[PDB]
Amino acid sequence: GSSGSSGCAGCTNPISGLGGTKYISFEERQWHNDCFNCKKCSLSLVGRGFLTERDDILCPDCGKDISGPSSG
Ligand SMILES: [Zn+2]
Ligand SMILES: [Zn+2]
Structure with a gap:
């Protein structure tokens, strides 16, 4: 039971x-006032300085402390 993806x-x-x-609109991607949440801690990003990961979004907290690849 779906209309469109x-x-x-x-x-x-x-x-x-x-x-x-009251929805979130990005350069190309979009989300809802609720759905709009980090991809690591699923924290409320609506009304914040969220980031833009490769193929996902994140919050300043996570994005700032991103484990990243095999590094120190
Ligand atoms: Zn939604
Ligand atoms: Zn986060």
Whole structure:
């Protein structure tokens, strides 16, 4: 029971997109006021300085302390 897989990049569902919704809109990707959460700690990013990972999003806390590849 789905309409379309184009809208919020979180709940695999379309966004209201009617005329002034409290949703998150990015350069290309998008999310909801709730769905919009880190990809490591799933923390509330709505209204914050979230980051942009390769193919995912993250929060300043995580992005700042990203384990990264095999390094020190
Ligand atoms: Zn959503
Ligand atoms: Zn995080």
